[PDB]
């Protein structure tokens, strides 16, 4: 009746003006995305692309969405986490006429219903590109394909609440959609670009077994993503989530970080810089040695559980903090997860205990002996759930990579240089991403003279480092 | 059946109570003070008028004062610092409080006057003050009441206009001699902050101070923890919540390198900023340089920093000429006092656009914009939640001990109409109360070791001139 | 013909002069003091006996006093802290100096007595002291000369025995009344360090202080710079030169968190160690915890830490029982005072093996070993070069102004036989003299801004109770 | 009766042996390798010719190889880095070593040749090379001996003239076919430097590499310690020992933000400097900016900085134009490539004044001066002691494992005449061996956790593309 366009689901469409104000502020902080718009504008490399996006529906993501649209893309979007949407960013995208299905605090049932909506393209048909963060859109396609080719038995063996919902979803879509719908989608998708370490792992798995249905670009392992987003982004946004959720004094507290890869390194720095004394656990002896060389005590979770005030899982692995650990923690210890999903902490094992909600994404859990723990975002990503995720400037680097990966797969694969395997962007594009961000922060880069470039075996314009260089 | 309050939304009270419970665990000094003094009820008969940021941390202080026997009325000391769920919890507990986040300046001063209309009639007999506004209202009313009225016709500020209007109104609507009645009944004031304490010493020096005062700011366990470590935690929190900018890669400028300036510069450098500092005091300037900060003037910094913070307690630090020279979408804020460290009033003929509560974008004729936080009032309290509970436990344990001193320990008039600080034995006790919660194990001196350095095993361990 | 000196190798004098010239550029406070006061000759007629670490930095101080007109005799105040090339340069410039790195305790006390036999006859009329040893010789000799001699037969350490033997030999050899003659002629003493100042305040309280004293340690520009930032730079320098250990990944324990312990902990933490702290003072312990250090007892640290540093000014901090529990090749050192923070004397019958100067390996019957630096005496001066020149410029400018105060500005006897500190105007001036060299640009208050915070534009900017 | 060595002074052996013992405790990777492989004697029958900086740390590596069964002859790979007491201790243990600190280029090359006159006759069968000089000698002599001699005449530099004359001399004084005899007997070379590995790949791509090679430069544990952590430990050490300047308050410029530059900037910032950086690589520049460093050109830095450090591996980084613009007594040094980062030769007509070994003052016609460390050579090895033992234990454990791989694990010819890297499980093993000494407790994965992230419980834990 009142709006002509309603092919979207947002919490409050009246937040759109506020969203637009914050998007305009983020654009100033995202020079790489804005420069990418100017450069690729005239040529419309994404004209004819139908991008299904599954990525935290934040203000930063809204700038990415509008960059893809400025390059010619038709778009449908969902968040990849039930607590990470910023409702004013989702309202601004809906108000711009782009189908988005994203609400902060949506349920798991809604989450998966919304993901399925990516694939009913407005006007008929399917997407032809996927932009993924964590692999959930990619997984819907592959599980439904597997089931539709006749291997349905896995849909009846659910191991968790979200598995049950997911398996229910695939069953319902095989019941309601035209026969062969998943192979139709599969044949139409020209590529997937994937943002995060866990999603990328799921892809290399499928690619090794030969089950990956379309080419993929691993955006996580761009240098200007993994060594910036994963590291500096968490260094800024982990303590932001903990402060907004709890308002605790960090000076004087002991924090335990599980994992010392890129996210754990950034998370331990976030906490140490804020005043905590940080301990770390690791299974990888190189990463453990790095933590020790940075001055962190390296201990087991059993050693840390009776002692630390704050626990952060940063592993991408499962069953890091168990009910046994939480039974041993001090009263009102804080527990949260910056890694993945909701199984780094054994949330499901806590569900027979008394939970008291304090405020959105903050709960107090009471044990039989009366000691309590404070749980943030029910064990899901604390920086996006309890605060606002990474700040715009570092997401500009991640999302310039995403945009260039979408151009590669959609526009620069006319010769099948990308087969049904996982690829990374070339170093010349990685360097270009960094170069686009230097002016905003006042870096003055030195130029090699020809004799200096020759001396070290590089061209003046780069690339400056071998493909094996680790930075 | 209780109605004697003004808060934004009383339905927030349950949320407030839950966060107050969480804060109690983080406030061992206040909680131990309830246990030690609760049996003796040292504040029985006290009528405490409090003017202090109506936060969750202040709620724990109010309820400690009440556990010690005090009758209480409360207001916030800043128009943006109230936490509305804290205020609602205090109202729901039957305690008169008049505190709304984003209240107007007229509401602010009218609420302050409501402190002195005690429920049941009469006046308070204690003041607990942060920034001296409640104290100033009594003294200015007293002065006018005595017949020195001309200063009321000479406001140099809009808020001065509101404040003199209020005094004029109370002179007409309250009985003859009401300010002298309040002055004679106030047994003492304890004041929390550097600016308020300076105004106290200056009244005491001129002979105009009407009742005894304890300078709580200069407790070691206040000035060297709250002003330093508090701002180190809460400054960047206010900036992040207001703006969500990446601090790594940004240049920030901090005016002042006293206690708050030291904590502020640390807040920003620890968050990844490259930090520059201004100072007028060569000792503080040399401290900043030895800590690795570049020390520059505001004129030097104005065209190039991304973030500006005033931390001086002084006026006219960031001017319209500075702001005209700033880069587009520079962030400006104040963590010191009042709203005149930045020349906010000089901006009010420019285009302001509200982004969200306590965040505005100000556009200049040449189209460059600046981002102003909390309309240039305290950014940590206005844009976030102020200092965290643990460090406020130390400040507020000092406040509670100061209230006990003035109301219960002045039977021999040891406190005259002068400004006093608490003794080092109490300062050391406040520290000691916080050690167990954070796992500190203290060493005990043996007697011959205590003798060798000339202290008693139980302290005090330092001379009164020691600077820590 | 001039040989009224004792140095290790007079051939080091050219090298010493080269490093003195380099240090002058790094010491703008002292050089500016020469420039201002040289032509006024305020120390003309002064005969200054100095007992202070005979380093390159002290040589710039000695030549500053000489440039102000002083006649001088000098000794080091520590047996391991002399830099032999600095001593050789001072001897080459014709100033009596008695200082060798590695001199014995016997020589150390014989050299101190040489201060008082002034060349050309007579005694000194000023003392510049670091640690109080020259001052103590005078007071012990005077006490014994006034009849009270029994204490001389009751030493409780080998160094006391050497000291008491010296006093006895002086009373035997020198003209009757010699100590009273010295005491009558000394117009003042200025004292550099925490321990020395504590001894002076004690004597003042007991009425035994023989002449006026200035406590130079408690200038802000000494205690909050030298004690803090000097140790932050020179502690880890001493440990690295002594041991060359990698510090990243090691656990270190610092006893004390006053000014020297704060700087020491920072030195180790900035170098990559995980640092623990002990304290007896709850305020300093809370500071350590708020700065992120674990606060533990020495008993908890002893089996765990790789590196131990005493920073207390107190005795018996690291005992034989602690060292028995330490892991093999743990490193032990002292940055505080004398050699009794660590129980070195209880180690004397274990097997010691010298590694190199000021580095020894001590082995226990169970075969674990510890690495001892400078035999438990000041590690930053014994194993490396002491504090760098720039921070010593602030300390030594203070010392120079104190000699001026006592020698040239006591015509009205404003300084009685008590302990005084320099005024804040001089403290501020010291800092101001150091700003240009490190590129600090100070802001100047406008008149209305000064009036607003209640200061003069020229300072002082802070109250006398300000703690910085 | 042992005489097969050339060192400065065999009497230094006892001091060297004391320091080797102390380093062993700090090199748990090498000592644990002795424990694990000692019983198996994997290097029995190995004749290892080593060319690696002859320091105390390298002595521990030499005795580790011997502990595994190896016969050994050794030389330094650099004329300046030899520690004469380390060389003496090795000669005194009966191991042929030819290494004197400060030897001529001619001696450097003749000593390298002596690696190949094996005691008892015959040749080495293993090379442990650091920079590729020993490998280059074999390959050039082989090339000449096959009849391609034209290159031996027509050299460029003086070092090339020395090298070519050495090849000519060996072709006369050694049997016909000597170089081909050596080539056929070498079972492998391990090499850890960039330039050495570049030479090996270049020869492998051209088919001219004569035997298998392991590139230890590729190792994660070698690369992070030898480049990042080692320089973070030893840069400021070299600067302090050379100059004793206060770092707090100073501005430093680091050219390069690769691994050595990252470690150097951190070294200086942690010690108190405010650090600026230059870079040509936008990714490395952005890293530096995100870590809070100002990124500028050398032209911008030249008039401003107090200290300059070159860390690029490139040439002509600091030029005469830059040094003309520097402030008086700025400090200049190099931690990057062995020479040519600073234009030293352009200073040769200025007045140079030696201050002490490896410290010189250079005076410009306008009388401003700069302080040059180690004549532009490596400041950490030249002015101090290089990387600490624990750092070198990581790189040297890698070398030991590579020697084991080539000598003992090539029965199936899995290594042909190409360049290989150690597999990630041996890189992980290097780290594993260092964990117990520094108190790390590693978590073990359960099988379902290992499965979930796609790894075996025993590793490797990361893909070969992982950057750490
Ligand atoms: N927001 C908070 O939570 C919080 C906490 C404590 C105190 N405060 C307030 O912060 C302000 C500062 O308090 P403080 O304890 O740090 O005081 P302080 O005296 O220790 O420090 C103020 C510093 O400002 C410097 N200064 C004065 N005018 C200057 C100018 N024009 N330019 C540069 N520097 C100048 C002074 O030299 C001084 O060192 C006060 O108003 C105080 O009440 C706020
Ligand atoms: N080596 C140097 O270059 C250098 C520089 C300045 C001062 N000093 C000397 O360092 C010593 C300390 O000086 P300071 O200025 O830091 O004094 P301080 O009073 O500021 O601090 C000493 C601290 O030691 C603590 N303490 C006392 N006994 C203790 C114990 N048994 N265990 C743990 N802590 C204990 C005190 O509580 C105190 O906080 C003095 O001897 C001083 O003369 C040395
Ligand atoms: N002193 C030591 O003990 C020690 C230890 C390890 C390595 N090194 C040597 O240090 C050098 C650097 O090693 P690295 O591992 O850091 O190499 P790297 O390749 O990781 O870093 C070199 C950096 O220099 C930058 N660069 C090149 N030319 C430049 C210029 N004109 N201006 C500014 N930046 C420039 C490059 O972009 C690169 O990021 C090599 O010569 C290496 O062998 C010395
Ligand atoms: N503000 C944000 N907006 C969008 N994505 C974000 C934000 N913060 C972190 N992320 C992304 O979330 C991923 C984790 O699911 C990370 O790979 C990171 O790139
Ligand atoms: N390089 C130095 N030269 C002279 N005195 C020093 C040096 N380093 C530290 N000191 C002084 O030694 C005192 C301790 O005896 C400290 O108070 C300090 O001022
Ligand atoms: Na954000
Ligand atoms: Na708070
Ligand atoms: Na020195």
Residue numbers in the entry:
A (entry chain C): 3 to 473
B (entry chain A), C (entry chain B), D (entry chain D): 6 to 473
Passage from the reporting paper:
The structure of BeSAHase in the crystal obtained by cocrystallization with cordycepin of a protein sample that had not been treated with ammonium sulfate (see §2.2.1) is a tetramer with three sub­units (A, B and C) complexed with Ado molecules and one subunit (D) with Cord bound in the active site. One NAD+ molecule is clearly defined by electron density in each subunit. There are three sodium cations near the active site of subunits A, B and C. 1490 water molecules plus three PEG molecules and one acetate ion from the crystallization buffer were located in the solvent region. The Ado molecules in structure (i) were sequestered by the protein during overexpression in E. coli cells. Since the protein:cordycepin molar ratio was 1:8 and the original Ado ligand was apparently replaced in only 25% of the cases, this may suggest that the affinity of BeSAHase for cordycepin is over an order of magnitude lower than that for adenosine, leading to the conclusion that cordycepin would not be a good candidate as an inhibitor of SAHase. The most interesting situation is found in subunit D of the Ado/Cord complex, where cordycepin is bound. When cordycepin is bound in the active site, the protein molecule assumes a semi-open conformation that is intermediate between the canonical open and closed states. The backbone conformation of subunit D is sufficiently different (see §3.3) as to place the side chain of Glu197 in a different direction, so that the hydrogen bond between the O2′ atom of cordycepin and Glu197 O∊2 cannot be formed (the distance between these atoms is 4.1 Å). Also, the hydrogen bonds created with the participation of the O5′ atom are not observed in chain D of the Ado/Cord complex , because the γ torsion angle (defined by the O5′—C5′—C4′—C3′ atoms of the ribose moiety) of the cordycepin ligand is twisted by ∼100° with respect to that of the Ado molecules.
SAH, which is formed upon methyl-group transfer from SAM, must be removed from the reaction equilibrium (which is shifted far towards SAH formation) by its hydrolase (SAHase; De La Haba & Cantoni, 1959), which splits it into Ado and homocysteine (Hcy). In this way, SAHase is a key regulator of SAM-dependent methylation reactions and of Hcy levels, which, when elevated, are a risk factor for neurodegenerative diseases, neural tube defects and cardiovascular diseases. A typical SAHase protomer is usually divided into three closely connected domains: an N-terminal substrate-binding domain, a cofactor-binding domain and a small C-terminal dimerization domain. The substrate-binding and cofactor-binding domains are separated by a bipartite hinge, allowing them to oscillate between two conformational states, closed and open, during the catalytic cycle.
